Amino acid sequence: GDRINTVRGPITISEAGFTLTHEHICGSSAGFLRAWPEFFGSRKALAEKAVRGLRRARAAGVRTIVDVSTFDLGRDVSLLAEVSRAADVHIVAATGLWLDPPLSMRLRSVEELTQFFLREIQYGIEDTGIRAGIIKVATTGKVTPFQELVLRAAARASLATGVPVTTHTAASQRGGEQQAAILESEGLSPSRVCIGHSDATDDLSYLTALAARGYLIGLDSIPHSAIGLEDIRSWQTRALLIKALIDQGYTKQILVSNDWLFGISSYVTNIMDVMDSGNPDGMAFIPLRVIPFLREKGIPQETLAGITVTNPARFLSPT
Amino acid sequence: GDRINTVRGPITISEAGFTLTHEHICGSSAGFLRAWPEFFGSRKALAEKAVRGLRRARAAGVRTIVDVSTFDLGRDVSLLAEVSRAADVHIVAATGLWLDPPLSMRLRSVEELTQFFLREIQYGIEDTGIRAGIIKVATTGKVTPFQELVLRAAARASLATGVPVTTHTAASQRGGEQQAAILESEGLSPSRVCIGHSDATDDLSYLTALAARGYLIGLDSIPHSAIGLEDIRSWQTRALLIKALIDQGYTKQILVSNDWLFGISSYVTNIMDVMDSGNPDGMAFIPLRVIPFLREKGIPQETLAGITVTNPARFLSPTL
Ligand SMILES: C[As](C)(=O)[O-]
Numbered sequence A: 001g002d003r004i005n006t007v008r009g010p011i012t013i014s015e016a017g018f019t020l021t022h023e024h025i026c027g028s029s030a031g032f033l034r035a036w037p038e039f040f041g042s043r044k045a046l047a048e049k050a051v052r053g054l055r056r057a058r059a060a061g062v063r064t065i066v067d068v069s070t071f072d073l074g075r076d077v078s079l080l081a082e083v084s085r086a087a088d089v090h091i092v093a094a095t096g097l098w099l100d101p102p103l104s105m106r107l108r109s110v111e112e113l114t115q116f117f118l119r120e121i122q123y124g125i126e127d128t129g130i131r132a133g134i135i136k137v138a139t140t141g142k143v144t145p146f147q148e149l150v151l152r153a154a155a156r157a158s159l160a161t162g163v164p165v166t167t168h169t170a171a172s173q174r175g176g177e178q179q180a181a182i183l184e185s186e187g188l189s190p191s192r193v194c195i196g197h198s199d200a201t202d203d204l205s206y207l208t209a210l211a212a213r214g215y216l217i218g219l220d221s222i223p224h225s226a227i228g229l230e231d232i233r234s235w236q237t238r239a240l241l242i243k244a245l246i247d248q249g250y251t252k253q254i255l256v257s258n259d260w261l262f263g264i265s266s267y268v269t270n271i272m273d274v275m276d277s278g279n280p281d282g283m284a285f286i287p288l289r290v291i292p293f294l295r296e297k298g299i300p301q302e303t304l305a306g307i308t309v310t311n312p313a314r315f316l317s318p319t
Numbered sequence B: 001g002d003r004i005n006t007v008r009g010p011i012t013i014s015e016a017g018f019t020l021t022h023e024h025i026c027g028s029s030a031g032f033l034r035a036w037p038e039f040f041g042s043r044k045a046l047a048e049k050a051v052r053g054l055r056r057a058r059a060a061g062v063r064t065i066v067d068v069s070t071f072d073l074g075r076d077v078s079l080l081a082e083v084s085r086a087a088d089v090h091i092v093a094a095t096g097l098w099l100d101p102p103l104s105m106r107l108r109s110v111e112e113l114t115q116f117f118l119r120e121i122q123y124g125i126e127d128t129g130i131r132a133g134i135i136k137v138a139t140t141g142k143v144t145p146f147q148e149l150v151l152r153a154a155a156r157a158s159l160a161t162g163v164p165v166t167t168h169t170a171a172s173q174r175g176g177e178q179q180a181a182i183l184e185s186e187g188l189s190p191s192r193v194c195i196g197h198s199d200a201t202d203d204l205s206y207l208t209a210l211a212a213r214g215y216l217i218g219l220d221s222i223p224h225s226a227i228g229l230e231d232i233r234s235w236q237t238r239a240l241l242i243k244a245l246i247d248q249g250y251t252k253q254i255l256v257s258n259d260w261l262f263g264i265s266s267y268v269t270n271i272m273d274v275m276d277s278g279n280p281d282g283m284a285f286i287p288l289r290v291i292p293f294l295r296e297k298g299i300p301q302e303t304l305a306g307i308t309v310t311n312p313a314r315f316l317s318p319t320l
């Protein structure tokens, strides 16, 4: 496919440019932003903060982000569109389900879920006409029966439309292997799938084996190590996983991001200020800090451009 | 004090008339109706079905319903307003939380939840300006820590505004007991509280003990017995609890409803069809079947009017 769905409409592959493949404008819950905007100060304040942040990321070279907020992460695509336009940064929206499905999702069959994901990709999200360009799934180490249904529905929607699938995994339980087995049982190519939060451990055997099968490896939370006052595991250590996979021959399988946001209600109160204090760069942390760090370790310009431009383009191109 | 908030604005107490105090337009989940309207055929189809159902209720004497759908039951107050205007039936909307709070609610403190309930009562729901006139709270048998926070936030919002609290219980587990204990610890008067789904038990000692403390008793799911699930008890057995509480001297404490809905996504697919087959009268079941049954059992008109008109008016009218 020669075009990608964004919250402002379709764009050509070449227009995506430097792309952060796992980000959020807001981390919330379905209906929450509209029912309780003053949780974030106001909707206007949240939008203004997001625009300031996206504009700074753009100044640092970012051209596109993929907002991997699903329905149950409180995705408000109208907000995504507002901020995309004002920051002049492309935003790709997601369908799928994260870890907080309400009853009206949890009690659905695989066939029903498949039709929901297809609606969001092929028709539009809500009444907005904005179409999703990626399918987000989350599991909790040992995949539950419902999460298995979500994975199967995601695979079927991907096979029907060509849009990729991206996952949430938990640290330590090597969640990508369980996810990969289920997705392949549906006939989905690994080249359509990113195993996310893969920078949460240093298990290189796990990462390389997935990469060797053709999975994209989401090293997508690099600055999360900077949130704490003095995290035992540094952001540099997370960033060195990028170099490790390059050195093993898997440059083409790497996707990098911040997994940042501008507001969060899906966590206890006041975490946003801790996050912003630890990583004032926000979404600009990848281009301003991680890229120069890797350059200094001797990774060539061509390799960094391949990771930040070519790999996301190949991933997002409907195939 | 003389006015109740509805989805079309304030009404006077006298305007409420025959009021069904526990009902739903749609039983769903936050965000769901707008993300997947075709689950219900279409939004338009859902709306039209609800308008017909409310017009039928109106023709059977109903003038107001209290839609006790909370945020997490997917309450869409814009839908309520549209259907209210088309059916010419008053609808009182709810704040509070039911049994499916999302993470962004589950992680909130009691102070935060209190602010949310207050905003929905004092400012409006979403950006609609439609204010809630009741606070709904749900618990399961033994109250969980989060449900306790919800109860306390509900009490605090009620005490600040005069708006009443109505509950979901598992009557078979005598759930009203733990609810009452928590609500009273906050200084809430039982006369501001309806212990709901109380018709799901035959334990009259449980019901009368609550009534003796001044709680309103929600005998609010009568036709759910006419459907196959829940229990083997008949709807007449449930309706006889109304007579039982009258005879025990608690007429003033009784509230009656159907707990009906016109669409449902927070259960298995097609359950709405099963429900409609078992209760073709919908929200008209109370006035068309239960009221005549009680008349046949010798309950006088004045008593029935007290239960269906006076008691809801006293309950809903904001009061300190
Ligand atoms: C919304 As997240 C902490 O799973 O990237």
Ligand SMILES: C[As](C)(=O)[O-]
Pocket: B027, B073, B168, B259
């Ligand atoms: C929405 As109900 C089944 O608790 O009245």
Ligand SMILES: [Zn+2]
Pocket: A167, A168, A169, A197
């Ligand atoms: Zn995640």
Ligand SMILES: [Zn+2]
Pocket: A022, A023, A024, A068, A259
């Ligand atoms: Zn994320």
Ligand SMILES: [Zn+2]
Pocket: B167, B168, B169, B197
């Ligand atoms: Zn209930």
Ligand SMILES: [Zn+2]
Pocket: B022, B023, B024, B068, B259
């Ligand atoms: Zn109910």
